[PDB]
Amino acid sequence: IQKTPQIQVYSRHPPENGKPNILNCYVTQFHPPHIEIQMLKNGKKIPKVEMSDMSFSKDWSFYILAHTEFTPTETDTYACRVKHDSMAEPKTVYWDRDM
Amino acid sequence: SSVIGVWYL
Amino acid sequence: GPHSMRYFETAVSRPGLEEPRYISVGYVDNKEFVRFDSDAENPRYEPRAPWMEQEGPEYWERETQKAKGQEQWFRVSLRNLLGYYNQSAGGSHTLQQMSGCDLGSDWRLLRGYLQFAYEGRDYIALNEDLKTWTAADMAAQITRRKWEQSGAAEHYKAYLEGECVEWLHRYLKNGNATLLRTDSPKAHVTHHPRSKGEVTLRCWALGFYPADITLTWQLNGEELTQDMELVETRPAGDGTFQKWASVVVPLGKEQNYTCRVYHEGLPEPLTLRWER
């Protein structure tokens, strides 16, 4: 009745510590369309996160792009936390600068 | 130009 | 070359007295060009590609009025389905629809599409003959019988062979330059520690458009598909796409591997290898 979201967390531009960038959290293959997606800095919810508008693919599943301004550093950690009804527990994906 | 529904499901 | 147009519609009912939310998105060659959303302050179809600004007020007004009708059609259809499936009120339900046409190389209709899904699963679809229906379960056979009796397929056939084609042609002329544009990928390779004497070489393709692209890693010039790690193509968020492919290479023997990137914007496929 529902599909389990696939998640990718990555920067819009190649990362350089100290340089303003944009962090993306691309979530696809989910259904129903209601979903909660949070972006985290050091365990804390980031206030200003933009969400693209509702879209779905030819297999009927929905996808959305959440993104936020961020400045990668040596020590801060960033992650995306997704909770959807097809998942018993929220899934948290950390940003890896190499991916 | 979008299509419209007439008869319902 | 071939082209297409599609309208993806969604209606979601929600717990409470609150009416369903209706969203309609139009695409030309898989590129969003118009959108309507009943949750908006002033709900109406809005351009989503610069070249649609060429259309006048009567266009937006007519499309907006069609959307208002659709929002009611979906409410009625959602209520009908609750009964077909024996569902009570106070639940969350989704009805979706994809409609549109595909043009061949001669720019003539190649195939018409008209399909629905309920709760994310196929419900009913118009067959390629644009005359008969394929119902996915017992509830949909109800709609199928109802539509064969009403002759609904004729209505959709008229749209798919007429209006859909006519307007797709107009949109291709209006957004000609824009729609066939290509942004070549910018590529580079990064080197990663990985394990014992083995490193990871990762080939990045960034800033490209359209999303279609192919990345390949080669061993001394010979293809190498087997243990290649790929990532699904992803939006950078500025309208361009990204993608990477990596392989674990024995330390030292880096310069022996080459990555080849193929994309329609490129004058020749890109060829590169570990640098630095």
CSV table of C-alpha atoms in Angstrom, one decimal:
chain,number,residue,atom,x,y,z
A,1,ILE,CA,0.0,0.0,0.0
A,2,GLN,CA,3.1,2.2,0.5
A,3,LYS,CA,6.6,2.6,-0.8
A,4,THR,CA,9.8,3.1,1.3
A,5,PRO,CA,11.8,6.3,0.3
A,6,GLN,CA,15.3,6.2,-1.2
A,7,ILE,CA,17.4,9.1,0.1
A,8,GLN,CA,20.5,10.9,-1.2
A,9,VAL,CA,22.2,13.7,0.8
A,10,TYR,CA,24.7,15.8,-1.2
A,11,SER,CA,25.9,19.4,-1.9
A,12,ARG,CA,24.9,21.4,-4.9
A,13,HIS,CA,28.6,22.4,-5.5
A,14,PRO,CA,31.9,20.6,-4.7
A,15,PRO,CA,32.5,21.3,-1.0
A,16,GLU,CA,35.3,23.6,0.4
A,17,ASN,CA,35.4,24.2,4.1
A,18,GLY,CA,34.3,27.8,5.0
A,19,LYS,CA,32.6,28.4,1.7
A,20,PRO,CA,28.8,28.9,1.5
A,21,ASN,CA,27.1,26.1,-0.4
A,22,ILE,CA,23.7,24.3,-0.6
A,23,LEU,CA,22.9,21.0,1.0
A,24,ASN,CA,20.4,18.8,-0.7
A,25,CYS,CA,18.3,15.9,0.5
A,26,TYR,CA,16.6,14.1,-2.4
A,27,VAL,CA,13.8,11.7,-1.5
A,28,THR,CA,12.2,9.5,-4.1
A,29,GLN,CA,10.0,6.4,-4.5
A,30,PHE,CA,7.5,7.0,-1.7
A,31,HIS,CA,3.7,6.8,-1.5
A,32,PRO,CA,1.5,8.3,0.0
A,33,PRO,CA,2.8,11.8,-0.7
A,34,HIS,CA,2.7,13.0,2.9
A,35,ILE,CA,6.2,12.8,4.3
A,36,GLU,CA,8.3,14.6,7.0
A,37,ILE,CA,11.9,15.5,6.0
A,38,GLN,CA,14.2,17.3,8.4
A,39,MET,CA,17.8,18.5,7.8
A,40,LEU,CA,20.1,18.4,10.8
A,41,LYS,CA,23.4,20.2,11.8
A,42,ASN,CA,25.1,18.5,14.8
A,43,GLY,CA,21.9,16.7,15.8
A,44,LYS,CA,19.8,19.9,15.6
A,45,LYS,CA,17.0,20.7,13.2
A,46,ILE,CA,17.9,23.4,10.7
A,47,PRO,CA,15.2,26.1,10.6
A,48,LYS,CA,15.3,27.3,7.0
A,49,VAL,CA,14.8,24.3,4.8
A,50,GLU,CA,13.1,24.7,1.3
A,51,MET,CA,11.0,21.9,-0.2
A,52,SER,CA,10.4,21.6,-4.0
A,53,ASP,CA,6.7,21.2,-5.0
A,54,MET,CA,4.9,17.8,-5.1
A,55,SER,CA,5.9,15.7,-8.2
A,56,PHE,CA,5.4,12.0,-9.1
A,57,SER,CA,7.0,9.6,-11.6
A,58,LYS,CA,5.6,7.3,-14.2
A,59,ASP,CA,5.5,4.4,-11.6
A,60,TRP,CA,3.2,6.7,-9.6
A,61,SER,CA,5.7,7.2,-6.7
A,62,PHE,CA,6.4,10.7,-5.4
A,63,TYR,CA,9.8,12.5,-5.0
A,64,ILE,CA,10.8,15.8,-3.5
A,65,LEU,CA,14.0,17.9,-3.0
A,66,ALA,CA,14.6,19.5,0.4
A,67,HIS,CA,17.5,21.9,0.5
A,68,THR,CA,19.2,24.5,2.8
A,69,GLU,CA,22.0,27.0,2.8
A,70,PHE,CA,25.1,25.6,4.6
A,71,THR,CA,28.8,26.1,5.0
A,72,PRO,CA,30.7,22.8,5.2
A,73,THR,CA,33.4,22.8,7.9
A,74,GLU,CA,35.9,20.3,9.2
A,75,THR,CA,33.9,19.3,12.3
A,76,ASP,CA,30.2,20.0,11.8
A,77,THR,CA,28.0,17.1,10.7
A,78,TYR,CA,25.0,17.4,8.5
A,79,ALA,CA,22.2,14.8,8.0
A,80,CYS,CA,18.7,14.3,6.6
A,81,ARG,CA,16.1,12.6,8.7
A,82,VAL,CA,13.1,11.2,6.9
A,83,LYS,CA,9.9,9.8,8.4
A,84,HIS,CA,7.2,8.2,6.2
A,85,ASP,CA,4.3,5.8,7.0
A,86,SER,CA,6.0,3.0,5.1
A,87,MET,CA,8.8,3.0,7.6
A,88,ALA,CA,8.5,1.8,11.2
A,89,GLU,CA,11.3,4.2,12.2
A,90,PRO,CA,12.7,7.5,10.8
A,91,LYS,CA,15.8,7.1,8.6
A,92,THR,CA,18.8,9.4,9.1
A,93,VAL,CA,21.3,9.8,6.3
A,94,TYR,CA,24.5,11.7,7.0
A,95,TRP,CA,26.1,14.0,4.4
A,96,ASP,CA,29.4,12.5,3.2
A,97,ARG,CA,31.6,15.1,1.3
A,98,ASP,CA,33.0,12.3,-0.9
A,99,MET,CA,29.5,11.3,-2.2
B,1,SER,CA,-3.6,22.3,-23.0
B,2,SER,CA,-5.0,19.9,-20.3
B,3,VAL,CA,-7.7,17.3,-20.7
B,4,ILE,CA,-10.8,17.3,-18.6
B,5,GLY,CA,-12.9,14.5,-17.1
B,6,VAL,CA,-16.5,14.2,-17.9
B,7,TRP,CA,-18.0,10.9,-16.7
B,8,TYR,CA,-16.7,10.1,-13.2
B,9,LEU,CA,-14.9,7.0,-12.1
C,1,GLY,CA,13.1,14.1,-33.3
C,2,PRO,CA,10.4,12.6,-31.0
C,3,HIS,CA,8.5,14.7,-28.4
C,4,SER,CA,5.8,14.4,-25.7
C,5,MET,CA,3.4,16.2,-23.5
C,6,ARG,CA,1.9,15.0,-20.2
C,7,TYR,CA,-0.4,16.2,-17.4
C,8,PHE,CA,0.1,14.5,-14.0
C,9,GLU,CA,-2.8,15.1,-11.7
C,10,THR,CA,-3.1,14.3,-8.0
C,11,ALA,CA,-6.0,14.4,-5.6
C,12,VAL,CA,-5.4,13.7,-1.9
C,13,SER,CA,-8.2,13.4,0.6
C,14,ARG,CA,-7.4,14.2,4.2
C,15,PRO,CA,-8.9,13.5,7.6
C,16,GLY,CA,-11.6,16.0,8.7
C,17,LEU,CA,-14.2,18.0,6.8
C,18,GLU,CA,-11.4,19.6,4.7
C,19,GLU,CA,-11.7,19.1,1.0
C,20,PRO,CA,-9.1,17.1,-1.0
C,21,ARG,CA,-6.0,18.9,-2.3
C,22,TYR,CA,-5.8,18.9,-6.2
C,23,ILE,CA,-2.5,19.4,-8.0
C,24,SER,CA,-1.9,19.3,-11.7
C,25,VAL,CA,1.5,19.5,-13.4
C,26,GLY,CA,2.1,19.8,-17.1
C,27,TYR,CA,5.2,18.5,-18.9
C,28,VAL,CA,6.7,19.0,-22.3
C,29,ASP,CA,9.5,16.5,-23.2
C,30,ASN,CA,9.5,15.6,-19.5
C,31,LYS,CA,10.1,19.2,-18.5
C,32,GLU,CA,7.6,20.9,-16.1
C,33,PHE,CA,6.0,23.8,-17.9
C,34,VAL,CA,2.7,24.6,-16.0
C,35,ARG,CA,1.3,23.9,-12.6
C,36,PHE,CA,-1.9,24.2,-10.6
C,37,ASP,CA,-2.3,23.7,-6.8
C,38,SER,CA,-5.6,24.1,-4.9
C,39,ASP,CA,-3.6,24.9,-1.7
C,40,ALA,CA,-2.4,28.2,-3.2
C,41,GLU,CA,-3.8,31.5,-2.0
C,42,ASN,CA,-5.0,32.5,-5.5
C,43,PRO,CA,-5.3,29.0,-7.1
C,44,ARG,CA,-4.6,29.1,-10.8
C,45,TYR,CA,-2.4,27.6,-13.5
C,46,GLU,CA,1.0,29.3,-13.5
C,47,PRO,CA,3.9,29.2,-16.0
C,48,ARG,CA,6.9,27.1,-14.9
C,49,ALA,CA,9.1,27.7,-17.9
C,50,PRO,CA,10.0,31.2,-19.2
C,51,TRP,CA,8.7,30.5,-22.7
C,52,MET,CA,5.1,30.0,-21.4
C,53,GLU,CA,5.0,33.7,-20.6
C,54,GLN,CA,4.2,34.1,-24.3
C,55,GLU,CA,0.6,32.9,-23.6
C,56,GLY,CA,-2.1,35.5,-22.9
C,57,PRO,CA,-4.7,36.0,-20.1
C,58,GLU,CA,-7.4,34.0,-21.8
C,59,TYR,CA,-5.1,31.0,-21.8
C,60,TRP,CA,-4.5,31.1,-18.1
C,61,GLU,CA,-8.1,31.8,-17.3
C,62,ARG,CA,-9.4,28.9,-19.5
C,63,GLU,CA,-6.8,26.4,-18.0
C,64,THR,CA,-7.5,27.7,-14.5
C,65,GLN,CA,-11.3,27.1,-15.0
C,66,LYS,CA,-10.6,23.6,-16.3
C,67,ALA,CA,-8.6,22.9,-13.2
C,68,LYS,CA,-11.5,24.1,-11.0
C,69,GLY,CA,-13.7,21.6,-12.8
C,70,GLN,CA,-11.1,18.8,-12.3
C,71,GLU,CA,-10.8,19.5,-8.6
C,72,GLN,CA,-14.6,18.8,-8.4
C,73,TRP,CA,-14.4,15.8,-10.7
C,74,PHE,CA,-11.7,14.3,-8.5
C,75,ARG,CA,-13.7,14.9,-5.3
C,76,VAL,CA,-16.7,13.1,-6.8
C,77,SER,CA,-14.4,10.2,-8.1
C,78,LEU,CA,-12.7,9.9,-4.7
C,79,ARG,CA,-16.0,9.6,-3.0
C,80,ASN,CA,-17.2,7.0,-5.6
C,81,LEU,CA,-14.1,4.9,-4.9
C,82,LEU,CA,-14.6,4.8,-1.2
C,83,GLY,CA,-17.8,3.0,-1.9
C,84,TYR,CA,-16.3,0.6,-4.5
C,85,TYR,CA,-13.6,-0.4,-2.1
C,86,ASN,CA,-15.8,-0.4,1.0
C,87,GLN,CA,-13.8,2.2,2.8
C,88,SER,CA,-15.1,4.3,5.7
C,89,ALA,CA,-14.6,8.1,5.9
C,90,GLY,CA,-11.7,9.6,7.9
C,91,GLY,CA,-8.9,7.9,6.0
C,92,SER,CA,-6.3,9.3,3.6
C,93,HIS,CA,-6.6,8.4,0.0
C,94,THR,CA,-4.8,9.3,-3.2
C,95,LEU,CA,-6.1,9.4,-6.8
C,96,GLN,CA,-3.6,10.1,-9.6
C,97,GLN,CA,-3.8,10.4,-13.4
C,98,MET,CA,-1.4,10.7,-16.3
C,99,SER,CA,-2.6,11.8,-19.7
C,100,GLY,CA,-0.8,12.9,-22.8
C,101,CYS,CA,0.6,12.1,-26.2
C,102,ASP,CA,3.9,11.0,-27.7
C,103,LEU,CA,4.9,12.3,-31.2
C,104,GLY,CA,7.1,10.2,-33.5
C,105,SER,CA,9.8,11.5,-35.8
C,106,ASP,CA,7.2,12.6,-38.3
C,107,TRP,CA,5.6,14.6,-35.5
C,108,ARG,CA,2.4,12.7,-35.8
C,109,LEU,CA,0.7,11.1,-32.9
C,110,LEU,CA,2.6,7.9,-32.0
C,111,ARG,CA,0.7,7.0,-28.8
C,112,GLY,CA,-1.9,8.4,-26.5
C,113,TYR,CA,-1.9,7.8,-22.8
C,114,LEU,CA,-4.7,8.0,-20.2
C,115,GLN,CA,-4.3,6.2,-16.9
C,116,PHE,CA,-5.4,6.3,-13.3
C,117,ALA,CA,-4.0,5.0,-10.0
C,118,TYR,CA,-5.6,4.7,-6.6
C,119,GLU,CA,-3.5,4.5,-3.4
C,120,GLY,CA,-0.5,4.3,-5.7
C,121,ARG,CA,-1.6,1.2,-7.7
C,122,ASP,CA,-2.9,0.9,-11.3
C,123,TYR,CA,-6.7,1.4,-11.4
C,124,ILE,CA,-7.8,1.9,-15.0
C,125,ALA,CA,-6.1,2.7,-18.3
C,126,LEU,CA,-7.0,3.4,-21.9
C,127,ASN,CA,-5.4,0.9,-24.2
C,128,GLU,CA,-3.2,1.9,-27.1
C,129,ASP,CA,-6.2,1.6,-29.5
C,130,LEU,CA,-7.8,4.5,-27.7
C,131,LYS,CA,-11.1,2.5,-27.7
C,132,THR,CA,-10.9,-0.1,-24.9
C,133,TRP,CA,-9.9,-0.1,-21.2
C,134,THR,CA,-7.8,-2.3,-19.0
C,135,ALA,CA,-9.1,-2.4,-15.4
C,136,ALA,CA,-6.6,-3.5,-12.8
C,137,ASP,CA,-8.9,-5.0,-10.1
C,138,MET,CA,-12.6,-5.7,-9.4
C,139,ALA,CA,-13.4,-2.1,-8.4
C,140,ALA,CA,-12.0,-0.8,-11.7
C,141,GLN,CA,-14.2,-3.2,-13.7
C,142,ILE,CA,-17.0,-1.1,-12.3
C,143,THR,CA,-15.6,2.0,-13.8
C,144,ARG,CA,-14.8,0.1,-17.0
C,145,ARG,CA,-18.4,-1.0,-17.4
C,146,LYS,CA,-19.6,2.5,-16.6
C,147,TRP,CA,-17.3,4.0,-19.2
C,148,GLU,CA,-18.0,1.5,-22.0
C,149,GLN,CA,-21.7,2.3,-21.5
C,150,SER,CA,-21.1,6.1,-21.4
C,151,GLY,CA,-18.5,6.0,-24.3
C,152,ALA,CA,-15.9,7.9,-22.3
C,153,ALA,CA,-13.0,6.5,-24.5
C,154,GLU,CA,-14.3,8.5,-27.4
C,155,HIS,CA,-13.9,11.7,-25.5
C,156,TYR,CA,-10.3,10.9,-24.5
C,157,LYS,CA,-9.5,9.7,-28.1
C,158,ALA,CA,-10.6,13.1,-29.5
C,159,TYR,CA,-8.3,14.9,-27.0
C,160,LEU,CA,-5.3,12.7,-27.6
C,161,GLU,CA,-5.5,12.9,-31.4
C,162,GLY,CA,-6.6,16.5,-31.6
C,163,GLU,CA,-5.9,19.0,-28.8
C,164,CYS,CA,-2.9,17.2,-27.3
C,165,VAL,CA,-1.2,17.1,-30.7
C,166,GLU,CA,-2.1,20.7,-31.7
C,167,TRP,CA,-0.9,22.2,-28.4
C,168,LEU,CA,2.2,20.1,-28.2
C,169,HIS,CA,3.2,21.5,-31.6
C,170,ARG,CA,2.5,25.1,-30.4
C,171,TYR,CA,4.6,24.6,-27.3
C,172,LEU,CA,7.5,23.1,-29.2
C,173,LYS,CA,7.5,26.2,-31.5
C,174,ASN,CA,7.2,28.7,-28.5
C,175,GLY,CA,9.9,27.1,-26.4
C,176,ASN,CA,12.0,25.9,-29.3
C,177,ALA,CA,15.4,27.2,-28.4
C,178,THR,CA,15.0,26.4,-24.7
C,179,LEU,CA,13.6,22.9,-24.9
C,180,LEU,CA,16.4,21.6,-27.1
C,181,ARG,CA,19.2,23.2,-25.0
C,182,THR,CA,22.0,21.1,-23.6
C,183,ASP,CA,24.4,21.9,-20.8
C,184,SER,CA,27.5,19.6,-21.1
C,185,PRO,CA,28.7,18.0,-17.9
C,186,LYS,CA,31.8,19.2,-16.1
C,187,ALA,CA,33.7,16.2,-15.0
C,188,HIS,CA,36.5,15.3,-12.6
C,189,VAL,CA,38.0,12.5,-10.5
C,190,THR,CA,38.6,12.3,-6.8
C,191,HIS,CA,40.8,9.9,-4.9
C,192,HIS,CA,39.7,8.2,-1.7
C,193,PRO,CA,41.6,6.1,1.0
C,194,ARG,CA,39.2,3.1,1.1
C,195,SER,CA,41.0,0.0,2.5
C,196,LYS,CA,44.3,-1.9,2.7
C,197,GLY,CA,46.3,-0.7,-0.3
C,198,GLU,CA,43.1,-0.3,-2.2
C,199,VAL,CA,41.7,3.2,-3.0
C,200,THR,CA,38.5,4.6,-4.5
C,201,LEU,CA,38.5,6.6,-7.7
C,202,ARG,CA,35.3,8.5,-8.2
C,203,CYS,CA,34.3,10.0,-11.5
C,204,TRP,CA,32.0,13.1,-11.1
C,205,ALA,CA,29.7,14.5,-13.8
C,206,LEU,CA,28.2,17.8,-12.7
C,207,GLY,CA,26.1,20.7,-14.0
C,208,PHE,CA,24.5,18.8,-17.0
C,209,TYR,CA,21.2,19.0,-18.7
C,210,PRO,CA,19.1,17.0,-19.8
C,211,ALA,CA,19.5,14.3,-17.0
C,212,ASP,CA,20.3,11.5,-19.5
C,213,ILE,CA,24.0,10.6,-19.2
C,214,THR,CA,26.2,7.5,-19.2
C,215,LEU,CA,29.4,7.1,-17.1
C,216,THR,CA,31.8,4.2,-17.7
C,217,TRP,CA,35.1,3.2,-16.1
C,218,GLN,CA,37.8,1.6,-18.2
C,219,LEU,CA,40.8,-0.7,-17.4
C,220,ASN,CA,43.7,0.5,-19.6
C,221,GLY,CA,41.1,1.6,-22.2
C,222,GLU,CA,38.9,-1.5,-22.0
C,223,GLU,CA,35.4,-1.3,-20.6
C,224,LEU,CA,35.0,-2.3,-16.9
C,225,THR,CA,31.4,-2.9,-15.8
C,226,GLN,CA,31.1,-5.3,-12.9
C,227,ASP,CA,32.1,-3.8,-9.5
C,228,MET,CA,31.3,-0.2,-10.5
C,229,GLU,CA,29.4,1.8,-8.0
C,230,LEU,CA,26.8,4.1,-9.4
C,231,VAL,CA,24.4,6.6,-8.0
C,232,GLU,CA,21.0,7.5,-9.3
C,233,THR,CA,21.1,10.8,-11.3
C,234,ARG,CA,20.1,13.7,-9.0
C,235,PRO,CA,19.0,17.4,-9.2
C,236,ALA,CA,21.6,19.9,-8.1
C,237,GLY,CA,18.7,22.2,-7.4
C,238,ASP,CA,19.6,24.9,-10.0
C,239,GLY,CA,18.0,23.1,-12.9
C,240,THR,CA,21.1,20.9,-13.7
C,241,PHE,CA,21.9,17.3,-12.7
C,242,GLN,CA,24.7,15.4,-11.1
C,243,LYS,CA,25.9,11.8,-11.1
C,244,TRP,CA,29.0,9.8,-10.2
C,245,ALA,CA,30.5,6.3,-10.7
C,246,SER,CA,33.4,4.9,-8.7
C,247,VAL,CA,35.7,1.9,-8.6
C,248,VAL,CA,38.2,0.6,-6.1
C,249,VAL,CA,41.7,0.7,-7.6
C,250,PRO,CA,44.9,-1.0,-6.3
C,251,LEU,CA,47.1,1.7,-4.8
C,252,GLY,CA,49.7,3.1,-7.3
C,253,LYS,CA,48.0,1.7,-10.4
C,254,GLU,CA,45.7,4.8,-10.6
C,255,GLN,CA,46.8,6.4,-13.9
C,256,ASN,CA,45.9,3.2,-15.7
C,257,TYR,CA,42.2,3.8,-15.3
C,258,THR,CA,40.1,6.2,-17.4
C,259,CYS,CA,36.5,7.4,-17.0
C,260,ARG,CA,34.4,8.1,-20.0
C,261,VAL,CA,31.4,10.4,-19.9
C,262,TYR,CA,28.7,10.4,-22.6
C,263,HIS,CA,26.1,13.3,-22.9
C,264,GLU,CA,24.2,14.9,-25.8
C,265,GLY,CA,25.8,18.3,-25.1
C,266,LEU,CA,29.3,17.0,-25.5
C,267,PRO,CA,31.2,17.5,-28.9
C,268,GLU,CA,32.9,14.2,-28.1
C,269,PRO,CA,32.7,11.9,-25.1
C,270,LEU,CA,34.8,13.2,-22.1
C,271,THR,CA,37.8,11.1,-21.2
C,272,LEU,CA,39.7,11.6,-17.9
C,273,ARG,CA,41.6,9.9,-15.1
C,274,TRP,CA,43.0,10.4,-11.6
C,275,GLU,CA,44.9,13.7,-11.5
C,276,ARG,CA,46.7,15.6,-8.6
